[PDB]
Design a protein around this ligand. Structure first.
Ligand SMILES: [Cl-]
Ligand SMILES: [Cl-]
Ligand SMILES: [Cl-]
Ligand SMILES: [Cl-]
Ligand SMILES: [Cl-]
Ligand SMILES: [Cl-]
Ligand SMILES: [Cl-]
Lengths: 272, 10, 99
């Protein structure tokens, strides 16, 4: 499958002479697997999945060392950004980074990512070629000039093509596994001879899922209400979709649930 | 294994 | 630019009166990451509400999951109050067992 790794990094400055808070979270196939947080008592990378509990302390120590590197890089960056944007002291600001790689089932790099944001907005980002930068901003042009002069891209490309790929591969051997949705449809009054039908999917992992409603064959993309997929809190996810239908016409409507843990898409209707 | 950003910073 | 929290309140398991359960308050799409999240039982703050570590999405916005043990009843009403700088007043979203 289209395996991925990401590192999501955040530094947040706060008023009153405090150092910036730095948090890095590592993800493999969208599951959080490591985390470092400067606010902790002993700042170090920690395992956040049990399949990481098999790495020796040299892994944690290496990664923790990189984190102290990033903290500092982020801290100086944050200060520069203040100046680039002509901003006052005693405010609160965020610098975020996303990094990582996409892999094929042949273990071959598909896409590499490296993107920064300031205050939650694109600042600069390495393009797909892994050679050139797209600056969002006036400020970011100055950063782009620095990184073109310096060859920074080469550094990030080598990381994305080498280390990122090799380590994603290792982390996966270390770990495929899914939980299928349990689906049901609930019935809810409205007035004016109308009824809400709500198709629920629960207990599913991974979080990617598609719910459709059919009126006797035809898909109701338009009249359908969704909610954003949400965590149940136990590792699994939840989603529902609903349509308003005429009273008595309920059996004409069919819910379909598509999920990669399923041998067939589920198909279901309101059952009184 | 995460990235180690090179200088220059932002 | 500030981004305003989206909130869903919902239980971990299909709710069944009298059976213990977990009530979630899933807060997303916000910026800046500073945020205050409370869960209320009949208008009164629930003590010792767990808060997940904070994360952010592909679109840079922050999210977080608050939860607490609870045992739904016929009439106990539950909510999630969110204070965040993107909003003048805090947003309260009430739990609806059908949603
Ligand atoms: Cl090692
Ligand atoms: Cl270092
Ligand atoms: Cl200051
Ligand atoms: Cl390796
Ligand atoms: Cl738990
Ligand atoms: Cl309770
Ligand atoms: Cl209030």
């Amino acid at each position: 499958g289209p395996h991925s790794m990401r590192y999501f990094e955040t530094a947040v400055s706060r008023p009153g002479l405090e150092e910036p808070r730095y948090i890095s979270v590592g993800y493999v196939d969208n599951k959080e697997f490591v985390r470092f947080d400067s606010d902790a008592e002993n700042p170090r990378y920690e395992p956040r999945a049990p399949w990481m509990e098999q790495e020796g302390p040299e892994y944690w120590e290496r990664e923790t060392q990189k984190a102290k590197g990033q903290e500092q890089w982020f801290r100086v960056s944050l200060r520069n950004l203040l100046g680039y944007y002509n901003q006052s002291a005693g405010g609160s600001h965020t610098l975020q980074q996303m990094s990582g790689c996409d892999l094929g089932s042949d273990w071959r790099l598909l896409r590499g990512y490296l993107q920064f944001a300031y205050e939650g907005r694109d600042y600069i980002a390495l393009n797909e070629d892994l050679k050139t930068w797209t600056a969002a901003d006036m400020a970011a042009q100055i950063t782009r000039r620095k990184w073109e002069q310096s060859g920074a891209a080469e550094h990030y490309k080598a990381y994305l093509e080498g280390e990122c790929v090799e380590w994603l591969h290792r982390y996966l051997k270390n770990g495929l596994r899914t939980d299928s949705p349990k689906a049901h449809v609930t019935h809810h009054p409205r007035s004016k001879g109308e009824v809400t039908l709500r198709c629920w999917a629960l207990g599913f992992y991974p979080a990617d899922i598609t719910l459709t409603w059919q009126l006797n064959g035809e898909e109701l993309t338009q009249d359908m209400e969704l909610v954003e997929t949400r965590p149940a809190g136990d590792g699994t996810f939840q989603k529902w979709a609903s349509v308003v239908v005429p009273l008595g016409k309920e059996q004409n409507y069919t819910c379909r649930v598509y999920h990669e843990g399923l041998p067939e898409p589920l198909t279901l209707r309101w059952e009184p | 294994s995460g990235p180690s950003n090179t200088p220059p910073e932002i | 630019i500030q981004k305003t929290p989206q909130i869903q309140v919902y239980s971990r398991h299909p709710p069944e009166n009298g059976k213990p359960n977990i009530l979630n308050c899933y807060v997303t799409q916000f910026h800046p990451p500073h945020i205050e999240i409370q869960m209320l039982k009949n208008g009164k703050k629930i003590p010792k509400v767990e808060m997940s570590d904070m994360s952010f999405s592909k679109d840079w916005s922050f999210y977080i999951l608050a939860h607490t043990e609870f045992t739904p009843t016929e009439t106990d009403t539950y909510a999630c109050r969110v204070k965040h700088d993107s909003m003048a007043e805090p947003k309260t979203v009430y739990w609806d067992r059908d949603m």
